[PDB]
């Protein structure tokens, strides 16, 4: 509400991106990438079908993929002997790739208060519970159990 286009600036700004991807003469050098949470609300004419031949969908990873993702963030992290990677993945339920890094960052902050070189297993238990509760708010959306 601090920027007023009067609904007329809506088309002039959006169609400018459309005319540069269609009417503009190019041999295919310019590569324009567009991504956001939901692209369905956007005008599909602005998407300019036939110029973009790649539609990539992303979903939540399974238990097999999260084991590889968890090892990436913990590669540079010092872990104790009792901490197992397969244990934390089993606890993770309905989490994306950003939720996995949040637990590794929060677990590092819990041990940062006590200033420990190797993060024990008690810090990961308290970190995984606070992320999925206070940090991540899981709504119902489409559910029907």
């Amino acid at each position: 509400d601090s920027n007023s286009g009067g609904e007329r600036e809506i088309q002039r700004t959006m169609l400018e991106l459309l005319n540069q991807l269609d009417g503009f003469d190019d041999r295919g050098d310019v590569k324009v990438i567009m991504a956001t949470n939901k692209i369905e609300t956007l005008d599909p004419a602005l998407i300019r079908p036939g110029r973009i031949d790649r539609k990539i969908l992303f979903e939540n990873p399974d238990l097999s993929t999260k084991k590889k993702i968890l090892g990436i963030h913990t590669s540079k992290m010092n872990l104790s002997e009792d901490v197992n990677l397969e244990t934390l993945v089993t606890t993770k339920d309905d989490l994306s790739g950003a939720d996995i890094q949040a637990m590794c960052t929060e677990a590092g902050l819990l041990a940062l208060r006590e200033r420990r070189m190797q993060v024990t297993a008690e810090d990961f238990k308290q970190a995984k519970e606070r992320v999925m509760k206070n940090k991540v708010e899981e709504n119902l959306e489409g559910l029907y159990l």
């Binding site: 007329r8 002039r12 169609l15 005319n19 692209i39 004419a45």
Partner: protein, 355 residues
Amino acid sequence: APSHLWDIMGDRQRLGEEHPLQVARCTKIIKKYVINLKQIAKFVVGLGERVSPTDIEEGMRVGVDRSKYNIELPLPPRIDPSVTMMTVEEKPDVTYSDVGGCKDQIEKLREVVELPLLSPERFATLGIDPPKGILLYGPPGTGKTLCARAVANRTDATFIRVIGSELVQKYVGEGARMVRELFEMARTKKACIIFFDEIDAVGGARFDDGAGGDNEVQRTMLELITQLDGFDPRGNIKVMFATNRPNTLDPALLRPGRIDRKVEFSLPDLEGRANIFRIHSKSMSVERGIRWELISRLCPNSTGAELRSVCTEAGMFAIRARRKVATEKDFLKAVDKVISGYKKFSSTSRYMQYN
């Protein structure tokens, strides 16, 4: 190296007291010429040495000397706008044969544009009036802009492509000047072509109530209509209106006399989509003995932009599937990929009929 040859004239074309000229415009002509400067200052002078009395015209930029003001050389008017200098393109890559299909929508555009330019004496025998404007809208993705660049190739003259968001400027009232910038070059450069892209953001008839600011857009058309059809019926070249939203356009803009030939693109049928894959068969790699009529038949009615994506993706299966050249098996996978796989948004395919 080339600078040494021009240094010989440096004793004349540089040190001379003539060249330091002050550019201005003559407001009043008495046959005493009242000339207004850029500093908001005016004066009255006569002719010069080589200045002809018939060269000075009303409302034309006329350069004068800096010290003692005297008319020296005339200059073309409308020197302020720098925007329309970049609107003229040169040699578009799309040729006349790049449009796929034998569809008669091609024959209608060449007779109302290319025919009077190439053969102006053909219609002069019957004593008729060639159509001034045309109409091309269609659904998005049919290659409408390809037909705009195809006519510019055969024309071999000045072509102007105007963006729908280019006319509206950052000030109120400057958009009215933007319209006079286009039609001024029509008299300067004869036998050219002007093109408007996405005229919906330009076109008026937005009424009034509830926005309060919609009157800034409609004033561009009121200047555009006046400069097109005015009091004095001034016109030469052809005007092209193109947009993807025919519903939001001014119903007065769609009325004839500013537009005669109306051509709306449609969905190519089994015979129409057949030539789309044939013009693309000359490119890429096509296996000998493959019938493209079965590929276009399995694909339902859709826009031409999604038809070229089939041939583009068909060559991409050989990389992952370990193939030499694109075969018929990889063509069937593109039907379930380019069409059936992409059915979720990111497409028009007759999505917007009106809004």
